[PDB]
Structure 1
């Protein structure tokens, strides 16, 4: 295999994305299962180590030994408030090694521990391989993205994950900066531009405010919620359906894990439908005690179930503007990133907040950060 181009990698909390600039355009690369995003998951079994789709596909079988959310640990001390709060909710173990966190698993019948950057290096190796499989050329050069709020230790640990994966990290760039690059906001003629990036995807909510002046980006403020995403919106639909099954059949399905899983899978897909249609139908045969569950939900009912959560996304926007010392009228560009920004109510709440201002949202919001990183990788080549 001959030498290939430089790629852009969005190393996300729950999913990762790799892109390449070629023929005057960015191409987001599909993985071996034909997926344009790859789970940031690593599983350890009695015989092998699995990465991406192969790891998330066996999580129900082996929950304790399947790692995800390494990005929540990377560059952090064990006694960090975030590490302490987060671990309670993961099925895998997190141990203290001389002040540093390590994931501890059972691998090939032995107890083994890995630093967060070692886990992230495995996901980066998979992203590297994905690029090589598509291009049919060796991939060494990459631009890797990080949140704007990452400190020195979190940026260095991400760079070390790239180094361990055999990648030459051309630059570590902020995720909101990559999103602005994707829309070519730095190529617009005129004076300084104030840009707000609303990122709602991967299970995290991040609002960033940047200023762009003659190609120079400056982070003015960051705000958000570390635990807000699509699962929360799915949960509200599950609760609604469980209550509906009680009303119609006088039966509680909530203690049957398989019935709740079938309902949850169908709610996730109905939610996606509700972003492009105003109604979604669900048919689940023999859901619980041989009862078939045939139902529907309108977009308006889905919005009512999530009203507080959707409305609440504006507090971080208000906070970001206050810390940047900016009025909402001073924002030149608004960019939507993350899968959940496809929700029409979220787009409506944000546009009405900015008094009818048009949003930048034409680029697939799950791919926008990798898109910008790919362009940057090409500019740095």
Structure 2
């Protein structure tokens, strides 16, 4: 009897948890990180998955694959596929109607279906759970967006199967976040729950009804092309402008310099969720020139003020769509690292006239956490 795990297979990051000894442990990976980039890369000599692949994207852009969740269960001709292809540095090719990513690997052209890319991410999740537990892991609950269709769900199950997992169930991300908070451990009148999920690359607002432990998705809204990366990118452009003033050089077209800056911005955005100042510290950013600087929480908020305000439009839209008043939402659940941003929490809480936000489970972990609870239930370990 190996325990079952919960796996959040995310667009930008993935996360795995396990229920044991009465609580969920979110498992840190081989780099010590509790989330792993949903990235895979191929070199002359090896296949990288997770942090190692993300860390070399600028050095090897055409052979580094990400956003495979944007392709999973899609057909090559799909409008979304054709549009998304224009933003990716890797090739997507048509295999008799199905998209495949095409890379070079150990000197040969190789191509992979979306679910094969995702199975590699799921193999890494599996292995880092096995390293932490010291035993084999086979059973898992895997999560997907509430708006996934049959094709997209079945392709994600296929990624699981290819990875050597027995997928116990596919459950929706917003339901998993609600299970994490024990919101379905509840009898009495129907409760409306709003999940506000601002991930690295997508923004999902979901209203669920939960009645005697049974979920229904009442409405969904959001923007599948807005996420924490957009806020990072506002900071990147701000610091490109600053480096130009201070050194009269535009780094804009050195992709290695821009990626090092972007990584420093992603770290600074997380730092600004807890502190009012964060540094940007980069040795030899460009032609040997160092870049050591800093930013306030206020300036980061200013750079993103329109996008932050704009997150309330999908909330209004979910509410209209669900025929519900603000006041009829019983619980609000935060998901995604960006929901730690104080200014976002203020905007959302003021929108809900002071209503408290469920945020005590790390929001970048909450989907894996709910999946791990459901996995243990389905296994009989809870």
TM over 0.5: yes
Deviation track 1:132-174 (CA, whole Å, cap 9, x = no partner) reads: 1111122111100000000010011111111121211111000
Counterparts of 1:125 and 1:242 in 2: how far apart (Å)?
Answer: 37
1:5 CA drift (Å):
0.8
- 8 A Cα contact 2:142 2:171, kept in partner: yes
Structure 1 residue 279, shift from structure 2 partner: 2.2
Q: Tell me if the contact between 2:140 and 2:166 (Cα under 8 Å) persists in the aligned partners.
A: yes
Contact 1:12–1:202 under 8 Å retained in 2: no
Deviation at 1:258, TM superposition (A): 4.7
Q: Which moved more, 1:363-372 or 1:97-106?
A: 97-106
Cα 1:355–1:101 change in 2 (3 A) is same
Q: Deviations over 1:177-201 (max 9, x none)?
A: 0000000011134311100001111
1:295 is paired with a residue of what secondary structure?
strand
Q: Are the aligned partners of 1:176 and 1:369 in contact in 2 as well (CA < 8 Å)? A: yes
Question: In structure 1, what is the Cα distance between the partners aligned to 2:23 and 2:332?
Answer: 23
Q: Alpha carbon RMSD of aligned pairs, Å?
A: 1.9
Cα distance in 1 for partners of 2:283, 2:71 equals 41
C-alpha spacing 1:303/1:150, structure 2 compared with 1 (3 Å)? same
* SS of match in other structure, 2:174: helix
Shift of the alpha carbon at 1:127? 1.2
- Distance in 1, matches of 2:233 and 2:291, equals 18
Check 1:177–1:108 CA distance in 2 against 1; reply closer, same or farther (3 A cut). Answer: same
Query: Relative to 1, partners in 2 of residues 1:94 and 1:252: Cα closer, same or farther, differing over 3 Å?
Result: closer
Bigger drift between 222-231 and 54-63 goes to 54-63
Q: Does the CA-based 8 Å contact 1:77-1:99 persist in structure 2? A: yes
Task: Give, in angstroms, the shift of residue 262 of structure 1.
Answer: 4.2
1:209 Cα offset (Å): 0.6
Deviation at 1:17, TM superposition (A): 0.8
Instruction: Give the deviation of 1:57 after TM superposition.
Output: 2.6
**CA separation of 1:350 and 1:162: change in aligned 2, threshold 3 A:** same
Change (3 A) 1:63 1:362: same
Query: Contact between 1:4 and 1:135, CA under 8 Å: does it hold in 2?
Result: no
Q: Aligned in 2, Cα 1:297/1:192: closer, same or farther, shift over 3 Å?
A: same
Cα distance, 1:92–1:251 mapped onto 2, change above 3 Å: closer
Deviation at 1:255, TM superposition (A): 4.1
With over 3 angstroms needed to count, the CA separation of the structure-2 counterparts of 1:310 and 1:60, relative to structure 1, is same
Bigger drift between 244-253 and 162-171 goes to 244-253
Greater Cα offset, 20-29 or 267-276 = 267-276
Closer, same or farther: CA 165–255 of 1 in aligned 2, 3 Å: closer
* Inter-partner Cα distance in structure 2 for 1:270 and 1:355: 30
How has the CA–CA distance of structure 1 residues 14 and 288 changed in structure 2, closer, same or farther, with 3 Å as cutoff? closer
Cα shift at 1:250: 5.1
Query: Which segment is superposed worse, 82-91 or 41-50?
Result: 41-50
Question: 1:43, CA displacement in angstroms?
Answer: 1.7
Whether the 8 Å contact between 2:196 and 2:334 is mirrored in structure 1 is yes
Cα 1:263–1:100 shift into 2, 3 Å: closer
Instruction: Indicate how the Cα distance of structure 1 residues 259 and 321 shifts in structure 2: closer, same or farther if over 3 A, else same.
Output: same
284-293 or 368-377, which deviates more: 284-293
Contact 2:12 2:38 in 1 (8 A): yes
Alpha-carbon shift at residue 242 of structure 1 (Å): 3.0
Q: Kindly tell me: are residues 44 and 296 of structure 1, through their superposed partners in 2, closer, same or farther at Cα, counting changes over 3 Å?
A: closer
Cα distance in 2 for partners of 1:58, 1:285 equals 17
> Relative to structure 1, is the Cα distance of residues 330 and 242 closer, same or farther in structure 2, using a 3 angstrom cutoff?
same
Q: Tell me, what secondary structure is at the counterpart of 2:270?
A: helix
Alpha-carbon distance change, 75 to 292 in structure 1, aligned in 2, over 3 angstroms: closer
Change (3 A) 1:312 1:110: same
8 Å CA contact 2:61–2:90 kept in 1: the answer is yes
Q: Deviations over 1:11-47 (max 9, x none)?
A: 1112111111001100111112211111212222223
Q: Is the 8 A contact 2:199 2:338 kept in 1?
A: yes
Q: What CA distance in whole angstroms lies between the structure 1 residues aligned with 2:222 and 2:35? A: 23
Q: Is the 8 A contact 2:58 2:255 kept in 1?
A: no
TM-fit CA distance, 1:283? 5.0
Once the two structures are TM-superposed, the CA of residue 114 in structure 1 deviates from its matched residue by: 1.2
Among 363, 373, 376, the alignment partner of 1:375 is 373
- The alignment covers a number of residue pairs equal to 379
* Aligned-pair CA distance for 1:282: 3.9
Distance change in 2, residues 1:7/1:245 (3 Å): closer
Moved more, 18-27 or 253-262: 253-262
Give the conservation status (yes or no) of the 8 Å contact 1:66–1:92: yes
Q: TM-score, normalised by structure 1?
A: 0.94
TM-superposition CA deviations, 1:54-94 (whole Å, max 9, x none): 32233223211111111100001111111001111111111
* Change beyond 3 A, Cα 1:249–1:157: closer
